[PDB]
Structures are given as structure tokens and as C-alpha cells.
Design a protein around this ligand. Structure first.
Ligand code: HEM
Ligand code: HEM
Lengths: 121, 121
């Protein structure tokens, strides 16, 4: 668990409170209602996978390889509407005890969330 | 919109990458699989409401009043399993142009997310 949902909700509440604050400056409740309607039913985690340094999962994956090559997280919206994040996993010094220090990354993490209201897998 | 889902996903990916890192130190993929299984299908925003400084929505709400009185966010797990956050909205100086500066808070924000796999409203 690691209490992820609670931590995610806390982070999300901070984001939402920040946006609500901007909307409140207008002194118009209608704008609040429209923000809420666009947020409801979304955010559910749809998938979480791990890939090796070659872009292969647990043939290589082009987007993952590209992500590994660019050395940056890749954000891709695609279809149900969903959002996918490919995060390269850095071969930190603590990891180097079991992963050759010659590799910048040991693999990548694929996270996908739902942008479809009411859809959670 | 304010691109909330993307910002939430980015924040979530940071949380997940941190946890995955701890699990990777074990060099055991089984533990990764169990974390993923416990995360899937959760996180969907179920509700987002606003309350005034008295605990009334747009009779007063006891938990909201308490939240306003304690001056701190209240985290409450309850039932479908869900997670509710009551965040008091501080009457910042920029808000004081239209809300009497004598009130510490102008109201509160209620955010509820799903802890039920597959449930998104
Ligand atoms: C971050 C700063 C602000 C916060 C936190 C805030 C918060 C709130 C909250 C919680 C409500 C709903 C409950 C209630 O009616 O008391 C509200 C209502 C309202 N606020 Fe603010 N507010 C802020 C800034 C402003 C500003 C700058 C204005 C003036 C331009 C404004 C004008 C009003 C008005 C007129 C309402 C009534 C809405 C209606 O017609 O029902 N607020 N505000
Ligand atoms: C934050 C540090 C670490 C990261 C980012 C990391 C990441 C990864 C990744 C992405 C994989 C799956 C793909 C692959 O097999 O290459 C993996 C596999 C593995 N890692 Fe790590 N690792 C870390 C630390 C460690 C440590 C400290 C050990 C040694 C105690 C370890 C031992 C292994 C082993 C043996 C596997 C094979 C798993 C299997 O049996 O299939 N890793 N690691």
C-alpha cells in the first residue's frame, strides 16, 4: 500500500485548492460549478507496468525506448480517453549494488490514469 | 480544466516512482506486483463541494464546522470505500477585498476520492 491513495488525495487536494482559489477571485459560483463538473469521475489509476533498460517488459517498446533515450518522462494522451506517463528509472548509486553502474537507467515505469468520467477499469 | 488531471497524474507518478524505488531495493518483482494490484482502479474523484464559513453548503455541517474550528484539513475514511478531505479555505489578503478581513476562513472545500477498485461514480 504505502498509503498511496491518501498521499495522492492530499497532493490532489492541494492542486484543487489552488485552482479553486483562482476561481474564487471572480466572486462567481458558476465558474466553480463548471470546474467541478469537469473534474468528477476522473483520475483512477488504470495501469502500472515496469520495463527494463532495453524497453522490454518484465519485443522492445518504441515509446519506452524513446523515453529512455531522451532520459525524460514522456506524457502521452491516447485511447476510453486515458493519460500515460513513461518514467525512466534512474540507476541511482543505491541501485548500482546490483545493476551495472554503466547504465544511466535500469528501466522505466508506465503509469496510466483515466480521463474518462466514471471509468476506472 | 486548468489541466488538473495531467497535474494530478504528474504528482501521482512522482509518488509511485518513489515507492517503486523502495520496492526495487529488494530485487524481488513479486513485491512490485502486489503494490500494483493494490493501486489499480482507485483514485477517481467522486465529489468536490464548497462550504461557507459557517459550515453550510452553497443546516451547518458538523465535520466541516469542526474542520473550520480546528483550522486544519480533516481526513476521513468512510463509505463504497471512499476518502474525504475537508480543507478550510483561508481568507487570504487577496480575498479580503470582498470577504470581511475579520474571518480567518471564507469557507471550506470537500474533496472525495475512491478507494474502491473500479468505482469512479
Ligand atoms: C482566495 C480568495 C477567496 C476565497 C478563498 C473565497 C471563498 C469564497 C467562498 C468559500 C464562497 C462561498 C461561500 C460564501 O458565500 O461565503 C465565496 C462566495 C463569494 N465570494 Fe469569495 N472568495 C475569495 C475571493 C473573493 C473575491 C476577491 C471576491 C470579490 C471580487 C469574492 C466575492 C464573493 C462573493 C460575492 C461571493 C458570493 C457568491 C454568490 O453569488 O453566491 N470572493 N467566496
Ligand atoms: C532504486 C534502485 C533500483 C532500481 C531503479 C531498480 C530497477 C530495476 C528494474 C527496472 C528491474 C526490472 C527490469 C530488469 O530486470 O532489468 C529490476 C530487476 C532486478 N533488480 Fe533492480 N533496481 C534497483 C535496485 C536493486 C538492488 C539494490 C538490487 C540487489 C539487492 C536489485 C536487484 C535486481 C534483480 C536481481 C532484478 C531481477 C528481478 C527478477 O528476478 O526478474 N535491484 N530492477
Amino acid at each position: 500500500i504505502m498509503d498511496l491513495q491518501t498521499r495522492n488525495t492530499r497532493g490532489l487536494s492541494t492542486l484543487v485548492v489552488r485552482d479553486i482559489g483562482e476561481l474564487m477571485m471572480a466572486g462567481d459560483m458558476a465558474v466553480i460549478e463548471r470546474y467541478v463538473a469537469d473534474v468528477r469521475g476522473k483520475g483512477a489509476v488504470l495501469d502500472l507496468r515496469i520495463y527494463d533498460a532495453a524497453g522490454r517488459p518484465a519485443a522492445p517498446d518504441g515509446e519506452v525506448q524513446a523515453a529512455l533515450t531522451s532520459g525524460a518522462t514522456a506524457e502521452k494522451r491516447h485511447k476510453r480517453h486515458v493519460l500515460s506517463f513513461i518514467v525512466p528509472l534512474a540507476n541511482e548509486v543505491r541501485c548500482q549494488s546490483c545493476h551495472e553502474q554503466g547504465a544511466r537507467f535500469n528501466g522505466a515505469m508506465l503509469l496510466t490514469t483515466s480521463l474518462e468520467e466514471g471509468y476506472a477499469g
